[PDB]
Amino acid sequence: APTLISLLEVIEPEVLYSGYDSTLPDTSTRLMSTLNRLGGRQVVSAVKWAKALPGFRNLHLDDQMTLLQYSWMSLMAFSLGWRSYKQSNGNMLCFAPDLVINEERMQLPYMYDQCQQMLKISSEFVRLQVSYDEYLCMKVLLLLSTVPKDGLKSQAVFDEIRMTYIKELGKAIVKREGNSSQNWQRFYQLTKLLDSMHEMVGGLLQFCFYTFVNKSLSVEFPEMLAEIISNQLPKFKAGSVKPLLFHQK
């Protein structure tokens, strides 16, 4: 019988190609439209990934839906952070192996600030030398990190699932460092990274809501992303979402 981490390793979706045609030149509108079209496909993958997470399907189906809609951006920015860390030690954004944004390429006026925001996520991975297994456990924890103020319909299964993956994060820490009695610092550092993901993602969510609503920028969104965003917009605006934080700030 093999380990839950090994399962996590197996069910991790392979990186998608964007199919971006660099023979036509880069514009702000084109890049963002491409990223969304890619993000739609990545979210599809994410739904299939979540369904294979032991515990997830015990949750009520509205809860499954809610968690996915609430956390999709941090899920995607985290993986982006990880790919960029492995691909170029955080110097570039690796959206896809055929869609790599280097410093020179981020110099587009409307792209610059969003790239700086995505770049800080990967810089955290660099600063901490996150290991693959640590990253995988943190990522499920992200899926379980944003909830409605009024709570979930199967709160207790949810609490049990969070506990399962917190321990699993513990095992990732052990595999990486051995039985150091300073493994407690690492756990601390990793939960603090998770907490800081709300802030880091908030900027990306603002851009996303803005470009989705102010359609004078002509940014295209696929149906998969449109469904989630238009559903999440009024909830986040009504200040009705609760970020779970490990440490009181």
Binding site: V44, M65, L68
Partner: peptide, 11 residues
């Protein structure tokens, strides 16, 4: 949320 509901039941 037709599409998300579909992907969660599929398979």
């Amino acid at each position: 949320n037709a599409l998300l509901r579909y992907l969660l039941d599929k398979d």
